[PDB]
Amino acid sequence: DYVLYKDATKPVEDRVADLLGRMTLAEKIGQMTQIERLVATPDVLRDNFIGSLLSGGGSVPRKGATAKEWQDMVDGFQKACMSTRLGIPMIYGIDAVHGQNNVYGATIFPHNVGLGATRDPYLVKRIGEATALEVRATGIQYAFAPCIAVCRDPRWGRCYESYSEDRRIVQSMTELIPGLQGDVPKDFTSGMPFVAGKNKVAACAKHFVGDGGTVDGINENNTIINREGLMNIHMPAYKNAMDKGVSTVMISYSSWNGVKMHANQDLVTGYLKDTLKFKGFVISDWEGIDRITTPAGSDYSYSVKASILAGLDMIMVPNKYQQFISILTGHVNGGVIPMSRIDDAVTRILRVKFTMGLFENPYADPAMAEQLGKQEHRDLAREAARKSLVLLKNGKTSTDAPLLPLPKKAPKILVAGSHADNLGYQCGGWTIEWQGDTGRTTVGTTILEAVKAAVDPSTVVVFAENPDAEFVKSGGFSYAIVAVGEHPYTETKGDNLNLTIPEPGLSTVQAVCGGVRCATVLISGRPVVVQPLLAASDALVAAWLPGSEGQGVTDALFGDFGFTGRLPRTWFKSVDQLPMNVGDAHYDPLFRLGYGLTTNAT
């Protein structure tokens, strides 16, 4: 017999209905199941009709694996899935949140907070375009991005993943979506999923909803706010995402007024599906359903029931798939979860797969491997890094000569600080490892290397990680560039109540600036206590977490381009003010949202 779902000339809805009408319960629940590569095997994927795989942070085939190695791994998993009775291709997901960041040699773009500082949605679209290509270079078809959290408290470990505390800036940056997925047609219906084809990836608006609104910025915690506030701060960018055809939405670990998002039928079904008319698929976060209960995973039967009834379509298990499949099967067999709910989840998952061309191109394209770390993408990352920089100070008094831009020609210059020659530090979390890492973890250019690449051949560059005051004063230096700040962190490990940079940092700045005129480059995922750093420095730049392309920093330091970045967040005077956002009754910032000094290119 002719098999309609296999016919590439047929409309998506027809293909979805045709395939769905053929599937067993096992095949349906399989589609709903996403498993980590570390638990996947050809037999597992085939026997359990698995619909999706992911790499968690740092979950890689080998350290230093080539683009081809990634393609081979993904294709190996795909072969097993294509060998099932129905041959439904799996979709492979990954956190490609600032480039294809788990991958060695991938271009690492500035984190979201810095991109907010650029106020350049077209730059962000271009970054999405480049990211899609580097993700496809590794055979992966699905990026868990963008995070459209509106971070309202910088004590949150994920504040750097938020473009801004101002939802209007977050809304504007949803341009990442058509970058990743491709532009939607003129005829497009808001809420439908869209991916243009094999050179693009499925995107993911996350984390629904109010992840950036938790008390004291506590990660995964309670967002306490009335519906009006939830709707005018935390929700709006989701509607922009619907208008741009975002393929998937990931649910937040957080709660809204005490109700776990992963169990919230009102918001997931009532609002996202039934009001916004979202027609792509809804995915849990990592063990998100487990964390509905306290303790997490103490009643997995309840977790499955609550999340699936709430309207989630695909569960990022990601390890204990046997338990997940067994429990869900039992719930359906016992009539506790109706077939209509299962059929809805599967319809959505298949819709996205058919729409994106996955049935036509289930395997990696070897000719895409060369897109990984490609120079054009690094040039874009370098542009982004430079545009993200916010100049906070450029002279100690109103009568001082501006320090920046610095001359490329000088007899001798000093580069200093824990962050001057540390690629891992300048990239921050979600880089190679989940939590990021220290040192030369990938291909890139540190601030020190960027300085050496920029300066006149006659200028002697001296590096000292933590020089004492005497070394600096006796060194015969024309000026110094000193880089300090936060260490890499991700999620809960980044939650921080004091927001004071680790030492040595301030001590190094004080020692260097005490001895010679200094430009301080602050590396951070967020505003941090900055008055002491300011007090010591002739100039100070908030560089955020600029990524692999440290020449973005020197492009502005040496005046190849003027500074243009403006704060996408309020800079607080002290942490005891927090939360404190532009518009509050008490608003007493050190630097207001939108603040930024400028220079002109020399």
Ligand X SMILES: *[C@@H]1O[C@H](CO)[C@@H](O[C@@H]2O[C@H](CO)[C@@H](O[C@@H]3O[C@H](CO)[C@@H](O)[C@H](O)[C@@H]3O)[C@H](O)[C@H]2NC(C)=O)[C@H](O)[C@H]1NC(C)=O
Ligand Y SMILES: *[C@@H]1O[C@H](CO)[C@@H](O[C@@H]2O[C@H](CO)[C@@H](O[C@@H]3O[C@H](CO[C@H]4O[C@H](CO)[C@@H](O)[C@H](O)[C@@H]4O[C@@H]4O[C@H](CO)[C@@H](O)[C@H](O)[C@H]4NC(C)=O)[C@@H](O)[C@H](O)[C@@H]3O[C@@H]3OC[C@@H](O)[C@H](O)[C@H]3O)[C@H](O)[C@H]2NC(C)=O)[C@H](O[C@@H]2O[C@@H](C)[C@@H](O)[C@@H](O)[C@@H]2O)[C@H]1NC(C)=O
Ligand Z SMILES: *[C@@H]1O[C@H](CO)[C@@H](O[C@@H]2O[C@H](CO)[C@@H](O[C@@H]3O[C@H](CO)[C@@H](O)[C@H](O)[C@@H]3O[C@@H]3OC[C@@H](O)[C@H](O)[C@H]3O)[C@H](O)[C@H]2NC(C)=O)[C@H](O[C@@H]2O[C@@H](C)[C@@H](O)[C@@H](O)[C@@H]2O)[C@H]1NC(C)=O
Supply the residues annotated as catalytic. 285, 491
Quote the least distance from Cβ 487 to ligand Y, whole Å. Answer: 4
Quote the least distance from Cβ 215 to ligand X, whole Å. Answer: 7
Alpha carbons 424 and 487: distance in angstroms, whole number: 9
Q: Is the dihedral of CA 231, 232, 235, 240 positive or negative?
A: positive
Assess 84 for contact with ligand X (CB under 6 A).
no
Distances (CA, A) of 415 to 98, 423, 466, 475: 27, 15, 10, 12
Q: How many CA atoms lie within 13 A of 130 on its CB side?
A: 26
Q: Quick one: which of 33, 222, 418, 564 contacts ligand X (CB under 6 A)?
A: 222
Q: How many CA atoms lie within 13 A of 453 on its CB side?
A: 15
Question: Contacts with ligand Z: how many residues (CB under 6 A)?
Answer: 7
Quote the least distance from Cβ 597 to ligand Z, whole Å. Answer: 9
x-or-dash pattern for ligand Z, window 504-543, by CB under 6 A? Answer: ----------------------------------------
Could you tell me if 136 and 145 are in contact, meaning their C-beta atoms sit under 8 angstroms apart?
no
Quote the least distance from Cβ 6 to ligand Z, whole Å. Answer: 47
Assess 221 for contact with ligand X (CB under 6 A).
yes
Contacts of 318 (CB under 8 A, 6+ apart): 34, 35, 36, 39, 54, 56, 286, 287
Alpha carbons 556 and 567: distance in angstroms, whole number: 16
x-or-dash pattern for ligand Z, window 562-581, by CB under 6 A? Answer: x-x-----------------
Query: Whose Cβ is closer to ligand Y: residue 57's or residue 191's?
Result: 57
Q: Where are the alpha helices (DSSP H) in 522-599?
A: 531-536, 551-557
Alpha carbons 498 and 576: distance in angstroms, whole number: 9
Quote the least distance from Cβ 295 to ligand X, whole Å. Answer: 7
Nearest to 282 by CA among 256, 313, 304: 313
222 binds, among ligand Y, ligand Z, ligand X, none (CB under 5 to 8 A by kind): ligand X
Assess 255 for contact with ligand X (CB under 6 A).
yes
Quote the least distance from Cβ 502 to ligand Y, whole Å. Answer: 4
255 binds, among ligand Z, ligand Y, ligand X, none (CB under 5 to 8 A by kind): ligand X
Assess 291 for contact with ligand Z (CB under 6 A).
no
Query: Whose Cβ is closer to ligand Z: residue 238's or residue 563's?
Result: 563
562 binds, among ligand X, ligand Y, ligand Z, none (CB under 5 to 8 A by kind): ligand Z
Query: Whose Cβ is closer to ligand X: residue 294's or residue 498's?
Result: 294
Query: Angle formed by the axes of helices 12-20 and 339-355, to 10°?
Result: 140
Question: Using alpha carbons only, how large is the chain's radius of gyration in Å?
Answer: 25
Q: Give contact residues for ligand Y (rule: CB under 6 A).
A: 438, 487, 489, 493, 496, 498, 500, 502-503
Assess 118 for contact with ligand Z (CB under 6 A).
yes
Alpha carbons 422 and 5: distance in angstroms, whole number: 51
Nearest to 508 by CA among 482, 473, 486, 489: 482
218 binds, among ligand X, ligand Y, ligand Z, none (CB under 5 to 8 A by kind): ligand X
Q: Which residues bind ligand X (CB under 6 A)?
A: 218, 220-222, 255, 294
